[PDB]
Design a protein around this ligand. Structure first.
Ligand SMILES: [Ca+2]
Ligand SMILES: [Ca+2]
Length: 85
């Protein structure tokens, strides 16, 4: 009775953590710079933002995979959070 798989990385492929879980965790939480990240998930829409839940860079997207490093804002991976719908 499980139909949800959200796997994302909070860093480079060969240098990041693999977060594989359904809707329940607080997105992401780690102190570091907003470097290259690997986001590959297919389930509705998700809101990505590197800051609080009421004062940060809002950026949502549909089911798709990507891994940029100069087109997603590289300020600082602090107080980052993302919820999947
Ligand atoms: Ca990152
Ligand atoms: Ca951030």
């Amino acid at each position: 009775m499980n139909a949800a798989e959200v796997i994302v990385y909070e860093h480079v492929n060969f240098g990041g953590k693999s977060f594989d879980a359904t809707s329940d965790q607080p997105g992401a939480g780690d102190n570091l710079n907003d470097k290259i990240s690997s986001i590959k998930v297919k389930s509705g829409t998700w809101r990505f933002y590197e800051y609080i839940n009421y004062g940060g860079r809002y950026w949502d997207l549909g089911p798709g995979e990507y891994s940029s490093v100069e087109s997603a804002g590289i300020p600082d991976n602090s107080i980052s959070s993302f919820r999947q719908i």
